[PDB]
Design an enzyme around this catalytic site. Sequence first.
Site, mmCIF file in Angstrom:
data_model
loop_
_atom_site.group_PDB
_atom_site.id
_atom_site.type_symbol
_atom_site.label_atom_id
_atom_site.label_comp_id
_atom_site.label_asym_id
_atom_site.label_seq_id
_atom_site.Cartn_x
_atom_site.Cartn_y
_atom_site.Cartn_z
ATOM 1 N N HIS A 32 -37.467 1.610 -37.883
ATOM 2 C CA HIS A 32 -36.842 3.047 -38.123
ATOM 3 C C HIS A 32 -37.928 3.703 -36.946
ATOM 4 O O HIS A 32 -37.580 4.773 -36.677
ATOM 5 C CB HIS A 32 -37.278 3.534 -39.211
ATOM 6 C CG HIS A 32 -38.422 3.902 -39.706
ATOM 7 N ND1 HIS A 32 -39.061 3.333 -40.544
ATOM 8 C CD2 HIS A 32 -39.314 4.997 -39.265
ATOM 9 C CE1 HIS A 32 -40.360 3.887 -41.005
ATOM 10 N NE2 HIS A 32 -40.584 4.849 -40.082
ATOM 11 N N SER A 61 -46.446 5.225 -39.388
ATOM 12 C CA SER A 61 -45.044 4.877 -39.169
ATOM 13 C C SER A 61 -44.803 3.828 -38.258
ATOM 14 O O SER A 61 -44.997 4.140 -37.001
ATOM 15 C CB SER A 61 -44.146 6.066 -38.983
ATOM 16 O OG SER A 61 -42.586 5.603 -39.070
ATOM 17 N N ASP A 104 -36.966 -3.029 -42.495
ATOM 18 C CA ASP A 104 -37.681 -2.162 -41.526
ATOM 19 C C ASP A 104 -38.884 -2.923 -41.066
ATOM 20 O O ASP A 104 -39.880 -2.712 -41.723
ATOM 21 C CB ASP A 104 -38.043 -0.978 -42.564
ATOM 22 C CG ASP A 104 -38.607 0.212 -41.618
ATOM 23 O OD1 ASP A 104 -37.862 0.379 -40.493
ATOM 24 O OD2 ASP A 104 -39.212 0.953 -42.219
#
Length: 368
Positions: free
Chosen positions: A189, A320, A239
């Site tokens: 992502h 992230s 992911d």
Amino acid sequence: IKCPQPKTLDEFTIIQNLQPQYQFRDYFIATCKQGYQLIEGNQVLHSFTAVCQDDGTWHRAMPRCKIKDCGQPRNLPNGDFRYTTTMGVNTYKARIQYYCHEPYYKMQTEQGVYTCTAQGIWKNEQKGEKIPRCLPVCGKPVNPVEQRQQIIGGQKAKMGNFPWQVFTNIHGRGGGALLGDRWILTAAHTLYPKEHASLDVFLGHTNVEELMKLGNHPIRRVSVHPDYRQDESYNFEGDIALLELENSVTLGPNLLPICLPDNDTFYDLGLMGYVSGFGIAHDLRFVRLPVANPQACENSQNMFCAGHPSLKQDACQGDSGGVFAVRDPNTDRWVATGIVSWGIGCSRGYGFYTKVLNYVDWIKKEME
Ligand SMILES: *[C@@H]1O[C@H](CO[C@@H]2O[C@@H](C)[C@@H](O)[C@@H](O)[C@@H]2O)[C@@H](O[C@H]2O[C@H](CO)[C@@H](O)[C@H](O)[C@H]2NC(C)=O)[C@H](O)[C@H]1NC(C)=O
């Protein structure tokens, strides 16, 4: 009708087809003992043949037999070699020993001993003519996080602490972990955000500006795991992604790879790990949090929950694409157990993370 029954100019010349006397039109041959080659003036000769001429004289001058020279040892990228014999002499029978720039690299197998063969090239006790290979050592920071502390909440990360930390900045600030010499593990992502390319990647430093001054690392290839689906509002399965650096980086105290997980226990409830990220927070910080009960986040099986409520915002340190790192003391090595995934509710004290162990196979496959 006769030529001079000749003799060697040293103990390295050998006479072939030797006879008691030498008549016209006859010939003798010269060669050398092992390790020595025929020399005539400043010239190596593949061979030597003298024909006895009519005037009673040999058509050519007896040559000399000298020691051979294997030359300058090949260079060992990320390593070096030393002479184990008179220094700097690459002559026949010389012995050198290659070695790697430990602790950062490790030699691929005293096996880096090459001696100068009679054939004139450096060879191993059967490691070939080929030199050793120095490989990146993973998860052994040279300035690891002190274990003599359990400092609740976010801390300023020191240099050397998370040497595998990667600052990414493609569709916003993101993170990732250096694997080996040229791979950065991260989230999908981060490359393909859901809810709808210039891969700016930096490494090697705690401070952002300093990191950027160090320069971007060009990405040569991107591999998004096949599961990851971005069109679908929320799946977070697959992911995880791999980036291949166009060129490889040089390991050292502030830039080292992290290891891959391989035992399921890296996801046992209550196990403490670390997370690092920037917030552009200017500087890298980190949090030590525990693997939480899945419900905690529920409130997938390719994921895991981590946090604690008495942590609020501090459970969003990871960037992230960043990595949830664990120090496995029964091997004293840091491994990447998780990948920072969707950060929804990390202010309630918990983070979600892709389980890396479940994709090790795919990763390794991609890295070959
Ligand atoms: C699979 O992991 C078992 C757990 O090992 C602990 O947790 C790891 C993540 C790591 O931090 C390690 O340093 C820890 O020991 C591992 O150990 C289990 O079995 C051993 C007996 O060999 C036992 O002493 C230990 O207490 C157990 N771990 C626990 C839960 O306390 C196990 O051996 C290992 N096996 C594999 C698949 O390699």
